[PDB]
Design a protein that fits this description.
Chain lengths: ~500, ~80, ~500
């Protein structure tokens, strides 16, 4: 009882070949012994950061500001906030991602009893929340005198500046508290049992040292996949360039609490980028660096030698990109992902496959070819969390989608354009769309017979995972064909 | 979370199966005849023995083998 | 000194390959030592028929009836008259081609002196000419009593009904004549010196044996390339099927004086076709037979063994054709032409490359690959000489272009359609368009460095002629590209 070997290994697929794209090949089906829902999508972003989902939103001005980065992190991916903005704007976007979910809030909004209901309303306007502990100084480290929330100031008619907070607080005698040096789980038990919405943390001197909010425990149960640091804040990435003024931007982003930096370049194998990696790794040794838009092992070597914690793979793929028709330079993305990942895995360096991801099948191909994570631009553009506003043109709801080497982006929003500037049709919310991509990746892995992305890659490197090349007519046959009209209702 | 594996489309009218399947039958018979096969059983035996020969097509052979070079046409099958 | 070898030989181009079309390759340029106008286009149609031009009009109901066949023969090609018509209609189309140019007219229209001016006008209405010798019987072999022409009946208004020809003729006393047994060249000298428009040929008994017309000497100087038989009539081809009733059609076409028969089939390697070739070669040993739409040497063998004088090459190419998507069956035409011609040349059997000829570059490729002649359907459709009438549809002057297995042709104009009943935009006259194709073939051969189609084929078989295979992007680069609009003003 024997059956002959069928299809190519990945090593065979890229050996006797020109550069393949994701469209040029299929994965052959395996054996299914498991449910798609039990497929593990745990992914290394860098040497020290693991995501529950392989998915990254690209650092583009039409893709990733704070709402996208929050939504991606809540879905168990991450967002890298774009750098086509002032350093102060970018750091404020990073701060919004880091403030959205909290363990101990150690720098809350605080007011004095001498402040007013108008000051609580203006605080709610600036920071988005009404739950404000009150201390004698109105600064964080002071003796606690009460707590003010929206239930204390709501349905007061108009006496805003007229009313001092001392008359409006829940006074410190009435408030439930925990001692300093309580663990987060112990503070959560106290808060959960108290049935209150805030729990202040106070030392033996009765002065405020932290506070915790019930809404973060709600965000816990609401978002099981969420990408969080050790102090339970969302993970945030940010882009920086490799110019000297990017050192100032990097300092603002690091004090804003950014977890990972991506060095943003067309061609990352440069003296400028290697110098920036060395500068970061000496000044901020805690900070993860993804360097390198690279497409060859020779480029990957120089950045792994410089000490990057991850690599970005792709050049001239990417929906919006024209680098290949402007510089002659790049690689077919499936070949680039395979070549760079097969090399970078020897050093324990994870790969991000960046650009040309049009479909969830392309995500499964990128992951199968050795990418540990996948970065999307246009596939997440025209979601609700993507920056800017919808418009109508051809009777179609469209959002702008620009590209960062677009000459319109380079107006600080001879110079050479490396991107066009375009539009994409509406997609709805990341919070529904990323669960569709997750379940699509799981069903892809299931048809392949892989229980996780880790076993999927090991099946690929051992040659258990088999591939078939597609003729152009196989790419037609594998697409929608032969119909008059069709309705591509994904999820 | 509820993964679609197909789209939903439309196709133009074809008429009855009781006329269309006799057209497919006769097309299969004419294909086998141009090939020199008296039955689908002998067609498969010619294929496995290597008597049946195939040629690969470039994309331009797929263009040349279709309708080409016309302003418009009328695909009046049966 | 030395220069390295560049490009593939034809043997290499088809060896390590899938089936190529004409679009899939180029011919590499040679050395030019001659003018394009001195490129010899002399072509074998069959073992015994040589044309001055490689060009054939296809036997289709929307391409070749008598006007097309006359025009093709005058341009030094040939037409094959289609068979999707009654045997009597097809033989009458052949008769029109054979009557258009004459050496000795040995079966002229003749009248009695007791016929009338009205009988001469009715004769002119039926046969197209007014020059009618008069014999006392009104039958050919009888005593010459005079000659009547249009200048004799000219401007006789309504005197038609009862004016006997006796008083209208130029009488036999006045007419210039030649003796029987005069050569055509000698009769032409007598006619040319006489300054008359007819010269009757009479025996010593003074009875009519032939006549010659000055208009045939005019047709001589007007058409230097013209394809003529030994008695100076135009060459005509005709199609026939291989059914039993085609034996009757073949008898009508042979007594109408057809020079060459083409056996019309999608797949000519059949017992039915081999039987028809044997039947023709025993019943009509003078008659040239082109058998075989064939695409392999194995098919060609059986018809060359049956005794065909030429082969048609092509299956499922052809603008109008759907045989491949209806029968799975055929071959890429460049490969078919090369394979069959390289085999058939060993037996001295010429090849017609039939169908898929969209451009004069495809003609040069077909001839370079070993075709001795090229047959066109759609490229000659919507010329003025093509059958039927023009119409307008999309604001475009169109003519119908049908195909012979199409389901509109097979209604005597379960049935399986092998063609698609379409339309082609106007091209103007064959008498202008074929000189353009001739000049294009000559400039193709000149860029290649071939002084004739015979040396072109010899350079191909010796491997002196080099080919380069084309990517799809070379086919884009080789076409019109990068323009907003263009005007393809050929000739
Ligand atoms: N106050 C607070 N407590 C948190 C937060 N995140 C987690 N915790 C607490 O720490 C525990 C951690 O266990 P899990 O919930 O299994 O792991 P997690 O990765 O931290 O959170 P999930 O995102 O829900 O998976 C939770 O039960 C909470 O009590 C947060 O943002 N704020
Ligand atoms: N109150 C408060 N919440 C903060 C602060 N910084 C971040 N947050 C987060 O914002 C959220 C507060 O949620 P809630 O407790 O529902 O908000 P609230 O304070 O009651 O204010 P309202 O919803 O406006 O009534 C939690 O996820 C907090 O972690 C801060 O200084 N104070
Ligand atoms: N009456 C007549 N004489 C002809 C005809 N064709 C040729 N001739 C005569 O034969 C001569 C030989 O002509 P050529 O030019 O050598 O060769 P051809 O193929 O016969 O004629 P072309 O068609 O002009 O090439 C001409 O000069 C005429 O005198 C014809 O159709 N009718
Ligand atoms: N006259 C004549 N010409 C014939 C006959 N059969 C074929 N033809 C050809 O038709 C053409 C006759 O041309 P002309 O001599 O110009 O015709 P015509 O006799 O002057 O008559 P009109 O043109 O009507 O004045 C020549 O090419 C002949 O070879 C026939 O029976 N009689
Ligand atoms: N730790 C606490 N101990 C006692 N009272 C508290 C405490 N935290 C908040 N309060 C008081 O409880 C009331 C509700 O505040 P809480 O944070 O629980 O809900 P809220 O977020 O304001 O309610 P809601 O979501 O409906 O707007 C207010 O009067 C507030 O001052
Ligand atoms: N061989 C001949 N000998 C003498 N007269 C002739 C001869 N052939 C024709 N004719 C006469 O010559 C005259 C002109 O006839 P011919 O054939 O030469 O020209 P046509 O074709 O009739 O002239 P056109 O082209 O102008 O219409 C007529 O009267 C005719 O009867
Ligand atoms: O202007 C540009 N030129 C070249 N590459 C760009 C430009 N802007 C963004 N990119 C790349 O394109 C990727 C997104 O590609 P997409 O997912 O196919 O739309 C980004 O993550 C970048 O790597
Ligand atoms: O109905 C048909 N089906 C298949 N082949 C046809 C049919 N009618 C004509 N042909 C072929 O198509 C050739 C003309 O092709 P074309 O020059 O490309 O237009 C003819 O000479 C025939 O060999």
């Amino acid at each position: 009882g024997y059956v002959p070997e069928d299809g190519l290994t990945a090593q065979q697929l890229f050996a006797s070949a020109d550069g393949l794209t994701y469209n040029d090949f299929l994965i052959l089906p395996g054996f299914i012994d498991f449910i798609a829902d039990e497929v593990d999508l745990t992914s290394a972003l860098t040497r020290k950061i693991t995501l529950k989902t392989p998915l990254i939103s690209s650092p583009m001005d039409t893709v990733t500001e704070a709402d996208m980065a929050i939504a991606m992190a809540l879905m168990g991916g991450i967002g890298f906030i774009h750098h086509n903005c002032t350093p102060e704007f970018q750091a404020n976007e990073v701060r919004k991602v880091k403030k959205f979910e909290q363990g101990f809030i150690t720098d809350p909004v605080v007011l004095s009893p001498s402040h007013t209901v108008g000051d609580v309303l203006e605080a709610k306007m600036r920071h988005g929340f009404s739950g404000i502990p009150i201390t004698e100084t109105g600064t964080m480290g002071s003796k606690l005198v009460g707590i003010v929330t929206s239930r204390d100031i709501d349905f007061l008619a108009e006496k805003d500046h007229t009313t001092l907070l001392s008359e409006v607080m829940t006074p410190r005698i009435e408030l439930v508290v925990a001692p300093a040096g309580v663990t987060l789980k112990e503070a959560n038990e106290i808060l959960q049992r108290s049935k209150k919405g805030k729990l202040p943390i106070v030392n033996d001197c009765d002065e405020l040292v932290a506070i915790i909010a019930r809404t973060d425990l709600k965000k816990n149960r609401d978002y099981p996949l969420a990408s969080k640091d050790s102090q339970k804040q969302l993970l945030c990435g940010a882009a920086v360039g490799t110019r000297e003024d990017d050192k100032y931007r990097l300092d603002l982003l690091t004090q804003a609490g950014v977890d990972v930096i991506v060095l943003d370049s067309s061609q990352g194998n440069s003296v400028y980028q290697i110098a920036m990696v060395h500068y970061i790794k000496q000044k901020y040794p805690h900070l993860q660096v993804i360097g390198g838009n690279v497409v060859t092992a020779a480029q990957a070597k120089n950045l792994i030698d410089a000490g990057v914690d991850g690599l970005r793979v792709g050049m001239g793929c990417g929906s919006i990109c024209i680098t290949q028709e402007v510089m002659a330079c790049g690689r077919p993305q499936g070949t680039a992902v395979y070549k760079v990942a097969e090399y970078a895995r020897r050093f324990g360096v994870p790969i991000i496959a960046d650009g040309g991801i049009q479909t969830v099948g392309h995500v499964v191909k990128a992951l199968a070819l050795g990418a540990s994570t996948v970065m999307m631009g246009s596939l997440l553009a025209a979601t609700t969390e993507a920056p800017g506003e919808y418009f109508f043109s051809d009777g179609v709801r469209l959002k702008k989608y620009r590209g960062m080497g677009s000459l319109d982006a380079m107006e600080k929003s001879v110079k050479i354009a490396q991107g066009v500037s375009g539009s994409i049709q509406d997609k709805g919310s990341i919070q529904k769309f990323v669960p569709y991509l997750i379940a699509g990746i799981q069903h892809g892995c299931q048809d392949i017979g892989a229980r996780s992305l880790s076993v999927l890659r090991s099946m690929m490197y051992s040659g258990e995972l088999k591939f078939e090349k597609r003729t152009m007519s196989a790419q037609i046959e594998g697409g929608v064909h032969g119909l008059h009209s069709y309705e591509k209702r994904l999820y």
